[PDB]
Amino acid sequence: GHMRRELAIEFSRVTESAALAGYKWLGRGDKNTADGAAVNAMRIMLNQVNIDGTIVIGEGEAPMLYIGEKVGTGRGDAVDIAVDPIEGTQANALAVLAVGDKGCFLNAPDMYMEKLIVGPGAKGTIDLNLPLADNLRNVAAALGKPLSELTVTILAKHDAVIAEMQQLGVRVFAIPDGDVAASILTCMPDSEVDVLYGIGGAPEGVVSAAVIRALDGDMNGRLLAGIEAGKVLRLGDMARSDNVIFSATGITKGDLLEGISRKGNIATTETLLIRGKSRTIRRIQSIHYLD
């Protein structure tokens, strides 16, 4: 092992660059252009860092940031990398990067995954081998509240989820954020989310698991068609190390970060930089001088 702590700011430059590369193209509505631009910038900046990095979750295999791609000067620590150069469902757009020790992310097939996520206030209360109705009661009691005051947060993406929550007699609130941001919102200190629930891609679930572990929340996943459809994945089965760093930079304004903001010829980025080994959260605002 192991990746060093000092590599944090270096990762924050990567998402700042992706965001700055993408934001105009995304502002013109040219979504494919934004993605290419964000991706390219992410690749260039990852290559200025002294790591021996491997993309393990990313753009597919994509001509760029593909699965198994090598990035970094190739010197220093061996690390695994997950990228999401433009996450979000447009507003609530973020550039996201996660780097950790080799083997830190579970390698899951592009399969569906049922996801139950909580923050630190309800850690250790969940277990997808139990009925969702029981899980929701356990979480409510851990947060010191009646089931009637619990709200299940879901993503806008859906209608079978709302019905299941109607059948369970629980409030539901749909938020406009993507997966990673919603997971992060859930585990931030003083979060207003009680529990987060959904069905989505398994790789994206492993990425959420990595940030939730970093922030000391909790998660289970159930793969839906080591090992197969049906098995319940604990947090530590998906996020396999505490030594991960997450960097997320705002492209447009969302519930978690400000978008890139200009004042005369100065552009300011806002990045959340989460260090799982020390369990810390920073907000970094960088100055960029415009043309």
Curated annotation (Swiss-Prot):
This is Fructose-1,6-bisphosphatase 1 class 2. Disruption phenotype: Cells lacking this gene grow normally on gluconeogenic substrates (succinate or glycerol). Changing E61A: 5.5-fold decrease in FBPase activity, and 1.4-fold decrease in substrate affinity. One of its GO terms (cellular component) is cytoplasm. E.coli K12 also possesses a FBPase class 1 (Fbp), which is the primary FBPase in E.coli and probably represents the main gluconeogenic FBPase. Changing E59A: Strong decrease in FBPase activity. Pathway: Carbohydrate biosynthesis; gluconeogenesis. It comes from Escherichia coli (strain K12). Catalyzes the hydrolysis of fructose 1,6-bisphosphate to fructose 6-phosphate. Is likely to be involved in gluconeogenesis during growth on glycerol. Also displays a low activity toward glucose 1,6-bisphosphate, and no activity against ribulose 1,5-bisphosphate, fructose 2,6-bisphosphate, or fructose 1-phosphate. Changing K31A: 2.4-fold increase in FBPase activity, and no effect on substrate affinity.
